[PDB]
Structure formats: structure tokens, C-alpha cells
Amino acid sequence: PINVAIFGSTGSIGTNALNIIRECNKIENVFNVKALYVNKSVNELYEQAREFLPEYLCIHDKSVYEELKELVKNIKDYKPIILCGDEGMKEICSSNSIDKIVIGIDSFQGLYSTMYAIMNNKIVALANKESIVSAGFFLKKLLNIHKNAKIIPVDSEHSAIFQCLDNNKVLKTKCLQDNFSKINNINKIFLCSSGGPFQNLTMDELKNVTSENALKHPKWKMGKKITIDSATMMNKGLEVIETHFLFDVDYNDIEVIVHKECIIHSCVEFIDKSVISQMYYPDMQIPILYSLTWPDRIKTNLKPLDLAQVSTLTFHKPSLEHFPCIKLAYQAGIKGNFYPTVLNASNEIANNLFLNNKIKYFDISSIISQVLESFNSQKVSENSEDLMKQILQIHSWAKDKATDIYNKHN
Amino acid sequence: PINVAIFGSTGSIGTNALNIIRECNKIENVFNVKALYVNKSVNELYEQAREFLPEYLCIHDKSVYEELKELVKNIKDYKPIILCGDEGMKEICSSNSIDKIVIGIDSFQGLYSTMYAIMNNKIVALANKESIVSAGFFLKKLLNIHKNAKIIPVDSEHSAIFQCLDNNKVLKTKCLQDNFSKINNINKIFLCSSGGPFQNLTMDELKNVTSENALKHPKWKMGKKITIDSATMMNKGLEVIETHFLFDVDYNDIEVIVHKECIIHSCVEFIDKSVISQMYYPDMQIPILYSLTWPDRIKTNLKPLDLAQVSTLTFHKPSLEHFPCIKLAYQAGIKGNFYPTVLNASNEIANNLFLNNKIKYFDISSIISQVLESFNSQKVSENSEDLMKQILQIHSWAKDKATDIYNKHN
Ligand SMILES: Cc1ccc(CCC[C@H](CC(=O)N(C)O)CP(=O)(O)O)cc1
Ligand SMILES: Cc1ccc(CCC[C@H](CC(=O)N(C)O)CP(=O)(O)O)cc1
Ligand SMILES: [Mn+2]
Ligand SMILES: [Mn+2]
Numbered sequence A, B: 001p002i003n004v005a006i007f008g009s010t011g012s013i014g015t016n017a018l019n020i021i022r023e024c025n026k027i028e029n030v031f032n033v034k035a036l037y038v039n040k041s042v043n044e045l046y047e048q049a050r051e052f053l054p055e056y057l058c059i060h061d062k063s064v065y066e067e068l069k070e071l072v073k074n075i076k077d078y079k080p081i082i083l084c085g086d087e088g089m090k091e092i093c094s095s096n097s098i099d100k101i102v103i104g105i106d107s108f109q110g111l112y113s114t115m116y117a118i119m120n121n122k123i124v125a126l127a128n129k130e131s132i133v134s135a136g137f138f139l140k141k142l143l144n145i146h147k148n149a150k151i152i153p154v155d156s157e158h159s160a161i162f163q164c165l166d167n168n169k170v171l172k173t174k175c176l177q178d179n180f181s182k183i184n185n186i187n188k189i190f191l192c193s194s195g196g197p198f199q200n201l202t203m204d205e206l207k208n209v210t211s212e213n214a215l216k217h218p219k220w221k222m223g224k225k226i227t228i229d230s231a232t233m234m235n236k237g238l239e240v241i242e243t244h245f246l247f248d249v250d251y252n253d254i255e256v257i258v259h260k261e262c263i264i265h266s267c268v269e270f271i272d273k274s275v276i277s278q279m280y281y282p283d284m285q286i287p288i289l290y291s292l293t294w295p296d297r298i299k300t301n302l303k304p305l306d307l308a309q310v311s312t313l314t315f316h317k318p319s320l321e322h323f324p325c326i327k328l329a330y331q332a333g334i335k336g337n338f339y340p341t342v343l344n345a346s347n348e349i350a351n352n353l354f355l356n357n358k359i360k361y362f363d364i365s366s367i368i369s370q371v372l373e374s375f376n377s378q379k380v381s382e383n384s385e386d387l388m389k390q391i392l393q394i395h396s397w398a399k400d401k402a403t404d405i406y407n408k409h410n
Helices: A012-027 A042-052 A062-072 A085-094 A107-119 A129-145 A156-163 A203-207 A211-215 A224-232 A234-247 A285-293 A324-335 A339-355 A361-374 A384-409 B012-027 B042-052 B062-072 B085-094 B107-119 B129-145 B156-163 B203-207 B224-232 B234-247 B285-293 B324-335 B339-355 B361-374 B384-409
Strands: A002-007 A031-038 A056-059 A081-084 A100-103 A123-126 A150-153 A186-193 A254-258 A264-270 A275-279 A312-314 B002-007 B031-038 B056-059 B081-084 B100-103 B123-126 B150-153 B186-193 B254-258 B264-270 B275-279 B312-314
Touching: A002 A012, A002 A085, A002 A285, A012 A031, A012 A042, A012 A100, A012 A285, A031 A042, A031 A085, A042 A056, A042 A062, A056 A062, A056 A085, A062 A081, A081 A085, A085 A107, A100 A107, A100 A285, A107 A123, A107 A129, A123 A285, A129 A150, A129 A234, A129 A339, A129 A384, A150 A156, A150 A234, A150 A285, A156 A186, A156 A234, A156 A264, A156 A275, A156 A285, A186 A234, A203 A361, A211 A224, A224 A234, A224 A339, A224 A361, A234 A254, A234 A324, A234 A339, A324 A339, A324 A361, A339 A361, A339 A384, A361 A384, B002 B012, B002 B085, B002 B285, B012 B031, B012 B042, B012 B100, B012 B285, B031 B042, B031 B085, B042 B056, B042 B062, B056 B062, B056 B085, B062 B081, B081 B085, B085 B107, B100 B107, B100 B285, B107 B123, B107 B129, B123 B285, B129 B150, B129 B234, B129 B339, B129 B384, B150 B156, B150 B234, B150 B285, B156 B186, B156 B234, B156 B264, B156 B275, B156 B285, B186 B234, B203 B361, B224 B234, B224 B339, B224 B361, B234 B254, B234 B324, B234 B339, B324 B339, B324 B361, B339 B361, B339 B384, B361 B384
Parallel strands: A002 A031, A002 A100, A031 A056, A056 A081, A100 A123, A123 A150, A186 A254, B002 B031, B002 B100, B031 B056, B056 B081, B100 B123, B123 B150, B186 B254
Antiparallel strands: A186 A264, A264 A275, A275 B275, A312 B312, B186 B264, B264 B275
């Protein structure tokens, strides 16, 4: 039995995780949902508790703690350990009855819970790409200390890449470890992109495109922030850096390719030039499930891929003139140091300004470029706690710098 | 240091094997070519011996044995073991210095050599699909006795399938064994076909196609027999049965799909419904090389796949009305017993009759159908020697029956 905790159980990753766990458990009892953790959605956590009956419930916000306790009394034959805040999260991470932790929380609490999952030598199914981009050095250092911890990628392209690898090789290394690509005989990565809603726009059309245009065309339904990143292709820019850190692939060996059908989820070229790819309908249940079953697979009742019906798969190179965020991401990654931290932080601000109709499409990349140009490389801290503080300081500086650039031009 | 013998070294598979070995050896000294074996092409063998300097040379035709001995005296610093006939082939197979044997021989001598390779517990890189189709039972039995012997598939689609698997699971089993698909979590196979030259033709157009029409294959120059099989799609029919035997995949779980670009070489759907596929330009060096490097990969200098340039990949269902050979292959496979032997043997005759303008396109399938309808299931011998004799008897019976049907019509 696979003992799982879900952090951010009411968000998109968390709900998809529970959906595929539910369906797989109908076929064979494979998963024990041991713990659920949410910020403040007490009623939604209660409904999940009633169905899954986890040993642990944790809610971050103290103001709904007593309500959760009273709601849980209604459930028959059920006496969970009901916990609160960062201390509850740490208790869940340290439990000997939990093997795998799904991190479906964004922002700092995602990184913080990832840190504690790694410190307790757990398998960590990580969906939060911003944490890998911003704090990749820190995660690498931490995984080198806590040698039985493993990050398994959930981001769909990185799951695809991971699924293209021979586990006879993967098991002799792990993600975020130096020489991962060499041990797995990886030569090059094709990183697939939907292209986003603006993929066919002219430069003149891009100049005054708005957030409404990005949001009101959802071919895949997803959150506002990632939708804007998909529109600018900064999502793929971040994913390039995510690929570099997860798999130790050189930036010159990562190619972004626009695959509008979203069937092939990414491809790995090996040193012999044979290419392996992973394919399915766009459905986050497969990447999430693989993160929890790896190195095995289990039966699902998902719709089988009908390739004949799909009929055509297409690929083209993205235009860097139309999607300058892609170039900025490569430049930041190649520069190294804390430039990825700065890229991510400045994008956080610029994305949100565009989302709220404060700046235009090309202002996004302008702001990010200016913050990157402003940044000065720092000596990388040797101590993990100092390094974390350094990352947070630079993240905060870069957000403030982006906001300051906006305030001056406004 | 990979120790390899090449059987049929001057044929298409043999020459491609030596080509990729040559190129890979320039990058790193990986392969020692330990033995070369040919029928009667003494000059071509001498030229290969000059380059590769194998410990063993064998020529099947005793009439050119002394000629080979005299030619080989011209090579400096080289004192090989020079053998002849079946006795030389068997001595090579029994050598402790040889680990892997590439079988690039068609017809009976290919099967006989495969048998001896298996009896000596070697890794056998096998492209001869007709032998797997015709004698799969016998090969399975032989592989159960000789526990360290392994067949590694070289047929491009089956190499593709094999490359899509997790070697952590493959290493717990081996090809042409019961439960291979269960151990590897395989649910279903997409078996890719070029579709040959006739995909867009009407039934009335197919009625009148000639072997000259059939020989103009859209993607690939290859031998006349396989070119005719590609035109009728009996090539894919035979490969369906090959898939069933190599990977223990049920016939209901093998889907033939027409992929005219011949970039994706086949796909494996796992029990979670995730699909893995292998891709490269049409080039037999990749399947041959993997058969010799498995479970590892080595560096090549092959042209990298340019997916953006390829641009489009297409997939559609084959029409069984237009390509009735496909249906006959499934029927023979599903029926089991020696029906695959009969299918292969009758096709051998019908293919050749069509190639030499003696029958029409739909006569190929008509003849095969009539022979299959005339066969009666026979009790399968539990004795290995009697089983091989049954297979030979039924093969011969089926060829004669096909010829008799033609004769009585003609
Ligand atoms: C599994 C799956 C594959 C593809 C899609 C379509 C959206 C792709 C991505 C969102 C993402 O980063 N995922 C899903 O990891 C948008 P884009 O950057 O344009 O490729 C959804 C779900
Ligand atoms: C490696 C490689 C892949 C594909 C091709 C194109 C010809 C495909 C095949 C020939 C074959 O059975 N091979 C190569 O195993 C013809 P078809 O039956 O129509 O699919 C050539 C070479
Ligand atoms: Mn993604
Ligand atoms: Mn083939």
C-alpha cells in the first residue's frame, strides 16, 4: 500500500490527485490517503475527510481549526489527528506512516513544505515549478544532505521526460543530482508547448492584446497566473530552467517546440540519437499518478488514446520576437547564479500587472529584462540556511525592483 | 567491450550492423567483431575481414574455403580461425569469446543458426520475422530451456516497442516468454505502418495493381519480398504475430496504425494508459545498434531528429477491405496452433507469384485464405525435435497447397 499525503488538497493538483487515487482504488486498493493539508477551505477539507478518512488533517489558518474539529465529529467511525499551521505540516512530514507527499501549494508555503518533506527523506511529488526555478541550488544542496529523499516531477513536460527514461538507469541517480543526464544517456530534450492563445498573432496584434484575451480562450482550464505565463510563453521559459535543474541538461541541449495538439508531452533524445516520447490526452491525472507509482505503473480506467482520431500531430519552432520571455529565460539560466531567482520574481510581478490590465504584453518582457540587467551576481552561500535566506532576499529585491520600474513609468 | 558475431555479414542487416559498429568504434572502442559468417561471397568476406580482423571467419560453401584461406594471407598481422559449413557456424556459437550474434540470414539457415545461438545461451539480435511467425512455439520452448539465451528484436517496430520499455522490468523477464506484458505493465501496442504505395487507391484500382507499381515504395528502398509485403500490408500482418510472440500481447490489444511519415516507429500503451513511443528518421542502424548495446546506449554521430522540420506526423486506420492480408494475419494468429506457420508459408508462395506477374493483388489474399481454410489444427508436440519437424512439415505442406491452388486455377 502506498501511503500518501496531499498538501493543498483542494487546489487543482490536489483534486486531480484525489480523483485518480479514488479511481485507481476502485480497481485495486493501492493508496492510503494518510494526510490532507489546506490553507483555509474548511468545508471542502471536511468533504474530502468524509470520503478519504485520513489519519491526519491539517489546516494552516488557526481561525478555522475549531470549526474543522466540530465538523469532523459528524463522520462515523473516525478519530483523526487534527493539526494546525506550520507545526502540523512538519508533524505530517515527519510521520513514519507517510511515504509520498504531493506538493500542490504555490509560493513560499510550497517551498517550505517541500523543504520539510526532503528533510524527512520522503518521496516528494513536486508540481510547483517556480520553487525549482527560484531555489534549485537550495533543493540540490538539501537533497545531497537528505540522501533518501527524492523529487519526482509532476509538471507535465518533466513527468513526460521522466517517463521516457529507463528506470534501470534512473534508480542509480535521482532528479536534481549532478550527472543525472550522463547516467541516463540523455543528449537533448524536446520541451513541448501548447503555444498558448497568442501563438498565431502578428506583432501588431500582440501590442495591445489583453489578459481577457488570454483568459477567455481556455483550451485547457487552468489558473490565472499559469494562463498568463502560457500566453507569454514564460511558462516554457520557466520550464527550460526546471528541466536544467531536474535533469542536469545543458541549456544548449533544451529545445522548446510548439506542439499545439498537446498529445506528445515532451521527448528525450539519447546519445545514440534515438528519441523516446510520452503521449496522452492533456490530463494531469497521468503525471500525478506516475509520481505516486514510480518506478511502477498501476491500472487505470482512463480513456485510451485514439491516435487515429487525433489524426495529426504538428511541431514548429517558437518565434523569439513574438515571445521574448523565452529568450530572457534562457539568458537567465545560462548566466546562472541567482538570475533564475530574479527572472521568476520579476515575472511574478509583471505577470500580475498584465493580468490586472496595468501594463501591455511587451512591457512584461521589458520589465523582466530591466530587473535582470539591474541584478548583480552574488557569492553563493555554502550553508543551506544562509542560502535559503539569500534566495528569499533576492526574490524580494527583484519583486520590489519590478514594481519600482512600473511605478516610475506609470 | 561488446563481443559480437555477424551471421550473413554481406546482407542488408549485416552491412548496416558493420556500418554502425564502424562509426561507433571511431567515437569509443566499444565493439570487438569476433566472427563473420557468409554463404559464398568470399571476396566480400575477405574485404570485411581486412577491416574488422575478426578472431573467426566462416564461409558456408566448402567449395570456396581454400580460396578464402589464400585471400586472407594478404592481410598483415592477422591469423584468424578460418572455418566452413554448419560445423564452423556451430563452433562460433559455442565460443566463450562471443556474447551477441546478429542473425542476418533469411530462410532455414537463419532459423538453424538462431537455434544454435540459443542453445549456447547467447544474446541473439534477430530481424527475421518469418522465423518468429513460423516457429514462435519452438523458439519459446527453446528459450525456456536455455535460460540465459535472449532474443533481442531488430525488426524496427519491435525494436521501437522494446525501446519503450523500462529495463528495470525487462531484466526480470525476456522476450518470447509467457507473462512478458504483465511483468512490463503493457496494456496495448500501436504497431506503425508506412501503409505502402496503395493507401489512397480504390478497390477497383487495387484489382489491377502490378508488382512494378508495388515496387515503388514511398519511404524506403528494401528487398523485393518485403516490398511486396509492404504493398499488401501482409508485412504488418506478420509483424502483428511477431508482436504477440515477442511480447505476449493479446491480438485484441495490437492495433495497426498507418503512419506514412515513418518517424514514430511504434508505441506502447501501459496499464495506466500512458503511451511511450520511439522515434527517429527511417534508418535501420538504430534498431541494430540497440540490439547490441541493450540494456545500455552508446554515442553515435547520426543526424539528430529535427522535429520542427518534420513538422507533421499523421495517423489513420488501415482499411481491412483494401488490405485483406491484415485480417488474415489476425485470424491466423487468433486461431493459434500452426496457423501462423501456414499463413507465412502460403504468403511466401503468393508474394512470389504476384512479384512475377502470375497472379493479381486480391489473388494473394485469396490464395492465403484458401490454404488457411484447408489447414486443420494438429496436436502440438511436447518434444522439441518433433515440434521442429512438425513446423517444417506444415511449412512445406502449406507452400505446396498454395502452389496447387495456383496450378488448378492457371
Ligand atoms: C497533462 C497536460 C498536458 C498539456 C496540457 C495543456 C497545457 C500545457 C501547458 C500547461 C502546463 O505547463 N502543464 C499542463 O504542465 C501550457 P503551455 O506552457 O502553453 O505549454 C494540459 C495537461
Ligand atoms: C528503421 C526504419 C523504420 C521505418 C522504415 C520504413 C519502412 C517500414 C516498413 C519496413 C519494415 O518492416 N521495417 C523497416 O522494419 C514498411 P511497412 O510494412 O509498410 O510499414 C525504415 C526503417
Ligand atoms: Mn508544464
Ligand atoms: Mn518492420
